[PDB]
Design a protein around this nucleic acid. Structure first.
Lengths: 78, 146, 143, 101, 63, 143, 182, 72
RNA sequence: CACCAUGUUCAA
RNA sequence: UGAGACAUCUGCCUCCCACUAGCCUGAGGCUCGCUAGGGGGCUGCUGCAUGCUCCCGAGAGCCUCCAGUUCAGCUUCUCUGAGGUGCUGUGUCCGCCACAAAGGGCAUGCAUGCUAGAGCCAACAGCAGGUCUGUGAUGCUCCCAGAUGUCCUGGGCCGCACGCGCACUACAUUGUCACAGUGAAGGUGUCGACAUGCCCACGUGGGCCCUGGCCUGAAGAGGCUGGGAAAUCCUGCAAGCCUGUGACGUACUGGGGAUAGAUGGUUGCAACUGUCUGCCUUGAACGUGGAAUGCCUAGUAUGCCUGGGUCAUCAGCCCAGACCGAUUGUGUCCCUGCCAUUUGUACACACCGC
């Protein structure tokens, strides 16, 4: 039928050594930390970004600011 | 936590003759197998003692073995019979989950059985029309302007 | 210190009763927890293995709030929008067997009983348990 | 002195208020412990037909309504006393029914 | 760069589709005055409105 | 001792009527029993607590609001509740404390939101045939 | 007595509209929520004393799906203003006023004779919020960057100018076609 | 617009010519005066007539209103 | 002041 | 005559009204509790704060045809017959051929001020508009027993190389799924035509409409037992959108759900050409759409569901109902047209003319 009128993102589905240690080291020093910011800065899955946000907030390297269904704002602890 | 990926992480496995993706979760990589679907997939992931949380690449040989066992003969693994794909199977009378190209093999068998005899539905199938009573006036158009 | 249900948010109280049923091991869950949906219009199973405990908690809270409730009422409560095809959605009631299961098991745990005129009603000790756990939800320190 | 319910219903509020006022006047002529006209919400019967007898033109719609007014009166009276005050002739259109328990 | 200018009298409505407003603007500045031009405005312009004219040289023909 | 100097008033927005009683008490404000800190939607508990934030808990530390809401939806019920709370505070202050304080409460409310004390008359418009809404129409089709 | 704070966190009174043209069309009416429903379309210009936080929320609710969803547009606004106050540590409402001030176009063009005309101080604010909110919309579409993030970033860049926010690089071409139509 | 009709104007005029000694420039007492003078089948019509009569009486107070004959 | 041609026969 | 006036509805108020509404009191019952708070003062590091200390007061959430103060508990909500009420109110500015108004725009007050909103009704002339298939409305005309009457069985109206109108669903993260929460309004409902029947029960009762509660089932659904000719029961219809959390992570994807396969109910005398529907499976196009074009000005558009009509079963339709709720404009005659005056005309079937 006649039709009238974006390269793919390869995001790491599971962690690796370099990206994981970089998450531990660098990210907790970002002003705004969010699923999208983590995924774009580390080339990592969005679900891994949620997992990372949860783990880092749990063990104290990041503090929540406004967490919700929409943008889950975290920030650098201090 | 933040587990890494193992070195044996298979990007694409093969679960009873279908290339499944290792990057999807397990219960949604399994839905690549024709005939398993995303409810039976989750049920066999729960019956196979396999965590729904991990990706499919991390699945090992014993995982996929005890998982194809369920996918192949599920009624021995407490999956009920109302859950199955062939629920009475004329010509056999047995209840089974047709999976991984026996789905369309059984579809071809059921169309052959209905076209051998001149059942109206088999006739519709062979003429390439819309069985089960639709209106073929303005919907199945399929291009071909005249 | 004084705390009563209707003083806590329903979330964080259902999530506490669903944790009190667990760790008590009382309710005798059915053999079909991991296979059944919760409504004819659901596209998927509950996806959380403690969905049964959250369902029992959301049923106990409802029996507390609205006494006299019945299985039909709970079907209207847990029911939602039917997922038909290219057709719009229409309100359809949820499955009413898991609800009756949870109700019979609450009443064998001595939380509810069928009222005199009809429907489930809250028992004295069920009120007691719910108020204790609301006093745990509120005032998390004294509980 | 027996409990009595006089229910009145009509498609005519004027003819209904006339007879309800008449019955209250009668029940106070020899005071019968009347509890005045309880006004039950009026029933609107809405019938929305299509104007045209054939499917031509802009599809218009006649919206007819029938309003049914209902008024209760409660008494503590003897049988023939209430039937007297009721039997004093009632306006047309008003349907009156008496109940005793 | 914007010379901000105050409106003093709405002259009326113009534009083929009745969308432009003829207003007379004086050129209220930080301490400068005594000249009013006639400009066109796209939008609702009530009174005392301070437009920001990117060019005060060429005014429009009154309509 | 229960002298219970009270005022009863109401607030309504679209079809939600909230009837509030303003007994003499200790600072209890509750809608249908649940405190005002637990009213859904979550983003609009600020909307339901606006009048208390404009007056001050100073003016509320002596009264007891109890609000029974019915009708409408979520937002109309929140607006009805806030209007009922404001009306109740103002009527209680004009009955049992100084009219100067009542006027202070009232104008602090009025120079913030007139729909804290005055009802919004906007109700829906009826549908008309030949279209799917009040003003919307069918899709006219020339040839 | 005490002025209301936007989300009990930020004050819509401390903001300093630097633009003498937009002074009285950008509104500093402090309010505890941008969800007030006070019927501003009743008169031609009453849609100017609506607090600017409250105009942004309706603009956020557009496209067929999102229409009439204030309960969600308010959450989008909260998250947006919060990430704003993190990134740029000034008042989110102030940086929003700056965004509006710098994103509103000052010349447009019509068909008086395709000829350039000046823009009202009200229409300037309308187009500011429109380009900001619409500009955020397309950025959020089909991306992992959530709407609160794209709106905050578009507002931050529209306050900086930054020539990479849709509002700024839209007002730019509008003023450009006007300058060629002079 | 709120242009009145002659069923209001021609009634205002005769009400004035017959009761100028009774009416005032206050709408809500001219209203209560006319609700006893005239037999108006409608309260909206009563209020339109009363408002137009108060307007004409205000113009009487102001200066010479051209179109009425106050005999006294 | 871009360009804007046409409308079978009788009947009304 | 028409317009207006009028009539109905929404919106504010009074009266009337209450064992079909709600609330209070009383009496019975529960469950949590006899903290915290407030007013302070001192206290530290004007100011700000932390502790300490004094005084004052234990209450909350519910259940019940239980009754009750002239032998009348009350009317804030709720129901409603009558009646109030706004008249463009007040201020300012503008407003004709000398003068003079009708009136209009802003601002403000009001429950409110586009004719208050919305509708109903709507004149005179017509169209050779639709309907003879709505009628025991009907003229002429045709058929009239091998019927164009009528009934019965089956089929068809749905049949598919295609063109179109229109509507529903989508193309997703202002999102889908999963759990949970909050939470409407209009209404309809049991042969008074059917039944002058069919079924269970026992020569006779009960059922047929809306359905509560209990039980069985994974569902669809089925049994037992009750209510309602209804503000009384279904029903406070615990509507969906929405909100909270979790999963997904930009991938035709957990978007989309068309198509198709095995087979379990239900309605019906009858389900094949699948009535509807359960369960597993199958997983199409579609990545916002060319020329072109519709509707729309405030509780409006849009979204989202609900009731009623049709209906033994079938709603993606229509007529209404609420719910969430705006962006812009407050003009113009540019486009498409309408009304009026002037003007021209070789038009009058009237420019689709001649």
């Amino acid at each position: 039928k006649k039709k009238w009128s974006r390269e793919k993102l390869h995001n790491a589905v599971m962690w690796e050594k370099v990206i994981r240690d970089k998450l531990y080291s660098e990210v907790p020093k970002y002003k705004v930390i969010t699923v999208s910011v983590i995924s774009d800065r580390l080339k990592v899955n969005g679900s891994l970004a949620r997992e990372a946000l949860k783990v880092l907030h749990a063990e104290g390297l990041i503090k929540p600011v406004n967490v919700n269904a929409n943008c889950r704002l975290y920030t650098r602890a201090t | 936590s933040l587990i890494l990926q193992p070195d044996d992480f298979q990007h694409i496995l093969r679960v009873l003759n279908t290339n499944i993706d290792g990057k999807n979760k397990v219960a949604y990589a399994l839905t690549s197998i024709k005939g398993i679907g995303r409810r039976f997939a989750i049920l066999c992931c729960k019956k196979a003692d396999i965590d729904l949380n991990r990706r499919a690449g991390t699945l090992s040989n014993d995982e996929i073995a005890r998982l194809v066992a369920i996918m192949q003969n599920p009624t021995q693994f407490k999956i009920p019979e109302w859950f199955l794909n062939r629920k009475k199977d004329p010509k056999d009378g047995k209840f089974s989950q047709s999976v991984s190209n026996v789905v369309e093999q059984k579809m071809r068998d059921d169309l052959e059985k209905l076209k051998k005899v001149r059942c109206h539905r088999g006739l519709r199938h062979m003429w390439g029309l819309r069985v089960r009573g639709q209106h073929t006036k303005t919907t199945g158009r399929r291009g071909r302007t005249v | 210190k004084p705390a009563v249900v209707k003083d806590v948010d329903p979330q964080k109280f259902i999530a506490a009763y669903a944790a009190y049923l667990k760790k008590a091991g009382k309710i005798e869950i059915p053999k079909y927890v991991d296979v059944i949906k919760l409504a004819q219009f659901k596209e998927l199973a509950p996806a959380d293995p403690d969905w049964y405990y959250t369902r029992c908690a959301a049923i106990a809270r409802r029996i507390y709030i609205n006494p006299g409730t019945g299985v039909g009422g709970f079907r209207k409560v847990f029911g939602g929008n039917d997922r038909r095809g290219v057709r719009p959605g229409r309100f359809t009631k949820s499955s009413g067997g898991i609800i009756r299961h949870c109700l019979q098991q609450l009443e064998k745990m001595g939380i509810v009983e069928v009222a005199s005129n009809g429907g489930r009603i809250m028992t004295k000790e069920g009120q007691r348990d719910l108020d204790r756990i609301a006093q745990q939800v509120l005032y998390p320190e004294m509980f | 002195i027996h409990k009595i319910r006089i229910t009145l219903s009509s498609k005519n509020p004027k003819a209904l208020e006339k007879v309800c006022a008449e019955l209250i006047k009668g029940a106070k002529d020899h005071k019968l412990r009347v509890r005045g006209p309880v006004k039950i919400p009026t029933k609107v019967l809405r019938i929305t037909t299509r104007k045209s007898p054939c499917g031509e033109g802009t599809n218009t719609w006649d919206r007819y309504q029938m309003r049914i007014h209902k008024r209760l009166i409660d008494l503590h009276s003897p049988s023939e006393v209430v039937k007297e005050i009721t039997s004093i002739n009632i306006e047309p259109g008003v349907e009156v029914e008496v109940t005793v328990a | 760069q914007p010379k901000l200018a105050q409106v003093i009298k709405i002259i009326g409505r113009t534009g083929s589709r009745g969308g432009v407003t003829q207003v007379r603007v004086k050129i209220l500045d930080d301490n400068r005055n005594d000249r009013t031009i006639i400009r066109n405005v796209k939008g609702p312009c009530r009174v005392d409105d301070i437009l920001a004219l990117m060019e005060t040289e060429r005014e429009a023909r009154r309509l | 001792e229960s002298k219970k100097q009270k005022v009863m008033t109401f607030g309504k927005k679209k079809h939600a009527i909230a009837v509030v009683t303003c007994n003499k008490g200790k600072g209890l404000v509750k809608c249908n029993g649940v405190p005002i800190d637990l009213l859904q939607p979550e983003p609009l508990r600020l909307k339901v607590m606006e009048p208390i934030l404009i007056a001050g808990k100073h003016r509320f530390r002596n009264v007891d609001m109890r609000i029974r809401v019915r009708g409408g939806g979520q937002t109309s019920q929140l607006y009805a509740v806030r209007q009922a709370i404001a009306k109740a505070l103002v009527a209680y202050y004009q009955k049992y404390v100084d009219e100067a304080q009542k006027l202070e409460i009232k104008d602090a409310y009025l120079q913030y939101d007139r729909t804290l004390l005055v009802a919004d008359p906007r109700r829906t418009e009826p549908k008309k045939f030949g279209g799917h809404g009040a003003r919307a129409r069918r899709t006219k089709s020339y040839r | 007595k005490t002025t209301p704070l936007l989300f009990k966190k930020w004050s819509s009174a401390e903001v300093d509209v630097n633009d003498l043209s937009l002074q009285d069309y950008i509104s500093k009416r402090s309010v505890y929520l941008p969800h007030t429903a006070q019927r501003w379309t009743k008169k031609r210009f009453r849609k100017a004393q609506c607090p600017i936080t409250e105009r942004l929320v309706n603009s956020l609710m557009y496209h067929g799906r999102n229409n009439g969803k204030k309960a969600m547009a308010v959450r989008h606004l909260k998250a947006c203003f919060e990430i704003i106050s993190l990134v740029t540590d000034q008042n989110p409402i102030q940086v929003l006023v700056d965004a509006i001030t710098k994103a509103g176009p000052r010349e447009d063009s019509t068909r008086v004779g395709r000829q350039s005309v000046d823009v009202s101080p009200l229409r300037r604010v309308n187009q500011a919020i429109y380009l900001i909110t619409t500009g955020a919309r397309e950025a959020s579409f089909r991306t992992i960057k959530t709407f609160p993030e794209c709106l905050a970033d578009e507002i931050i860049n529209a306050s900086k100018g930054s020539s990479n926010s849709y509002a700024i690089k839209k007002k730019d071409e509008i003023e450009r076609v006007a300058k060629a139509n002079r | 617009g709120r242009v009145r009709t002659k069923t209001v104007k021609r009634a205002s005029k005769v009400i004035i010519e017959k009761y100028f000694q009774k009416l005032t420039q206050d709408f809500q007492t001219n209203k209560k005066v006319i609700c006893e003078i005239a037999i108006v089948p409608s309260t909206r019509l009563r209020n339109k007539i009363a408002g137009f009569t108060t307007k004409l009486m205000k113009r009487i107070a102001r200066g010479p209103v051209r179109g009425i004959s106050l005999k006294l």
